[PDB]
Scaffold this active site. Sequence first.
Site, PDB file in Angstrom:
ATOM      1  N   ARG A 111     -14.762 -39.385 -18.544  1.00 20.03           N
ATOM      2  CA  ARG A 111     -13.873 -39.335 -19.859  1.00 20.03           C
ATOM      3  C   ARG A 111     -14.536 -38.434 -20.727  1.00 20.03           C
ATOM      4  O   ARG A 111     -15.854 -38.261 -20.839  1.00 20.03           O
ATOM      5  CB  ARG A 111     -13.681 -40.860 -20.168  1.00 20.03           C
ATOM      6  N   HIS A 164      -8.111 -38.384 -22.405  1.00 17.14           N
ATOM      7  CA  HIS A 164      -7.974 -37.507 -21.159  1.00 17.14           C
ATOM      8  C   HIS A 164      -7.922 -36.128 -21.603  1.00 17.14           C
ATOM      9  O   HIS A 164      -7.908 -35.631 -22.872  1.00 17.14           O
ATOM     10  CB  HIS A 164      -6.562 -37.949 -20.746  1.00 17.14           C
ATOM     11  N   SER A 210      -4.690 -37.764 -15.133  1.00 19.44           N
ATOM     12  CA  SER A 210      -4.189 -39.052 -16.051  1.00 19.44           C
ATOM     13  C   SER A 210      -3.359 -39.902 -15.439  1.00 19.44           C
ATOM     14  O   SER A 210      -2.153 -39.457 -14.919  1.00 19.44           O
ATOM     15  CB  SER A 210      -3.585 -38.291 -17.299  1.00 19.44           C
ATOM     16  N   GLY A 211      -3.248 -41.228 -15.270  1.00 17.06           N
ATOM     17  CA  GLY A 211      -2.624 -42.054 -14.809  1.00 17.06           C
ATOM     18  C   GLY A 211      -1.237 -41.993 -15.379  1.00 17.06           C
ATOM     19  O   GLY A 211      -0.118 -41.906 -14.945  1.00 17.06           O
ATOM     20  N   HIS A 212      -0.949 -41.873 -16.927  1.00 20.15           N
ATOM     21  CA  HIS A 212       0.178 -41.649 -17.495  1.00 20.15           C
ATOM     22  C   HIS A 212       0.867 -40.286 -17.186  1.00 20.15           C
ATOM     23  O   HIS A 212       2.107 -40.625 -17.107  1.00 20.15           O
ATOM     24  CB  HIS A 212      -0.149 -41.780 -19.187  1.00 20.15           C
ATOM     25  N   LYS A 237      -8.416 -40.258  -8.619  1.00 14.88           N
ATOM     26  CA  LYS A 237      -9.038 -40.622  -9.640  1.00 14.88           C
ATOM     27  C   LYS A 237     -10.744 -41.047  -9.363  1.00 14.88           C
ATOM     28  O   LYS A 237     -11.621 -40.432  -9.610  1.00 14.88           O
ATOM     29  CB  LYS A 237      -8.838 -41.788 -10.407  1.00 14.88           C
ATOM     30  N   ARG A 277      -2.020 -38.387 -24.256  1.00 14.97           N
ATOM     31  CA  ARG A 277      -3.197 -38.895 -23.774  1.00 14.97           C
ATOM     32  C   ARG A 277      -4.621 -38.064 -24.513  1.00 14.97           C
ATOM     33  O   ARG A 277      -5.646 -38.375 -24.529  1.00 14.97           O
ATOM     34  CB  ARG A 277      -3.524 -38.990 -22.475  1.00 14.97           C
TER      35      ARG A 277
HETATM   36  O1  VO4 Z   1      -5.512 -42.513 -16.794  1.00 19.11           O
HETATM   37  V1  VO4 Z   1      -5.164 -42.661 -18.422  1.00 19.11           V
HETATM   38  O2  VO4 Z   1      -3.803 -44.414 -17.862  1.00 19.11           O
HETATM   39  O3  VO4 Z   1      -5.948 -43.349 -19.147  1.00 19.11           O
HETATM   40  O4  VO4 Z   1      -3.712 -41.693 -18.549  1.00 19.11           O
END
Ligand code: VO4
EC number: 1.11.1.10
Length: 574
Positions: free
Chosen positions: A357, A493, A399-401, A350, A487
């Site tokens: 974004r 995202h 994406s973190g998710h 990231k 997301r």
């Molecule tokens: O990085 V994201 O937690 O907003 O999916």
Amino acid sequence: VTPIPLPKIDEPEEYNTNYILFWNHVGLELNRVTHTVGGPLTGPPLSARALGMLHLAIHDAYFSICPPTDFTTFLSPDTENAAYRLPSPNGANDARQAVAGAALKMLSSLYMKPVEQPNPNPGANISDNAYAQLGLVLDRSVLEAPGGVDRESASFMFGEDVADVFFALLNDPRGASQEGYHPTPGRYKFDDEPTHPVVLIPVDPNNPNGPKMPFRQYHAPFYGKTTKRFATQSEHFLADPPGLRSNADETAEYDDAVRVAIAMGGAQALNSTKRSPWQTAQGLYWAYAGSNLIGTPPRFYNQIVRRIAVTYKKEEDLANSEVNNADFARLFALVDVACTDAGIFSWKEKWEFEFWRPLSGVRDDGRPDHGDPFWLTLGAPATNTNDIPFKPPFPAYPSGHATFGGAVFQMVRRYYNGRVGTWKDDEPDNIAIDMMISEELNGVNRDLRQPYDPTAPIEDQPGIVRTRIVRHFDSAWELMFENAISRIFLGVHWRFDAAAARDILIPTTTKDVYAVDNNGATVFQNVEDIRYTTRGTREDEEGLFPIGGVPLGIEIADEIFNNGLKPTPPEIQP
Ligand code: VO4
């Protein structure tokens, strides 16, 4: 101190009769409480780390006393390196107390006031009320533990020592430090969110109604590149995102991505929003935006894994079954360690690329026929609050998710393959679950009309209640997929932050441009037909790398699992 009234959890109460599950539950409670009071270990990556540490300690405490046959402990008692040397039982044969001491010591070290110097600078922002509320949770858990807690037993003390080793070895006190970091404006570059460019934070956390000060937050910009990895045996990398470096020429993909972003992730009432009511539900379902009484994604993933664990347990007795105890202790260690490492690498990538974004991309696009200077996203829900609060921002790719989900669910797949059904490690499974409810849509939590009141239960506070949606999923492959695309539905995202658009969308005759239905909504491939095969290049490295968070997560889980949950060799640590 008035105890915060916590809303009931949608899960069979029988689950907590098992002590491995009970302690997991306590970790999840602390997760949601810390995000309600602003305590330590907030945010996606660090909240995952806390659960990984908790389950590593539990894992070794239990397996030291009731040794496994097909695998060993994470650390060994005969390690030459003192920092990686596991304590010896020497008589301690009460696994229940060993787990209790391990869990209690670890959680206390993690959540209790760092009086030993760390209070300054690091903890200098957390109020005393936050610590007080967290202490209450810890205090009553001891009284709620199935079978009780005998703090005097040798086993309990052994567990404590196990926790000490893990805490000292893996704790990262300065993990969320942003000191020194500043954005670098430009096309494709991450910068302050246009909707929340600055925050007014109290100069004194113990006086939230006193003088405020303008502040600009960035969520853990150095964590990924400096932190100690848990069980990964190598560094993981992603392809350059469309528009940057070796893929700066991938403009058709980027342009179509912008188009899909507007149509699928815009605010509910915008004429340009084509997202359906059901897709809106899918987006909110996996949110867990660090909200009051809810917490972060790692909490939801554990809630789901808990259901899977009980649904597919080998024995009926949840309370007194060593088969179940070992099974759960092993599963959660694998899952939460995979989750921790997933957080580390997603954060590393990231901040490496610092990709902007969709909100900023669409607004600052600059082309009259492509952007929308006034666009608004559906966004991450501000559940159990009366406004849209500022939360520390972080770059989009990956994406973190998506990474968390890829890691957690691939691990579950690897673990249950041949037990629940049989499948190729890279193809859809049959691990189905029923009655899975998200706290984002449970008929209890809501969008308040006035500020949240921590002295009153959520049900007595006026607001618009979230519709209760009870779901069923056919496989962990589906969970993985939906968690990722949710997301896109929220507009937070880009499609490539999840996975290669080629692997998840329906192609057209035009390359990099994908199919839309009658009403303009993007069409996705059927979950059963999805394969994360499309790779891309990196400017700084030769070879083909995965694109998006899901592929990254899968790789992290496979590596950890293949190596049987072994510590990252210290020689490859940052
Ligand atoms: O990085 V994201 O937690 O907003 O999916």
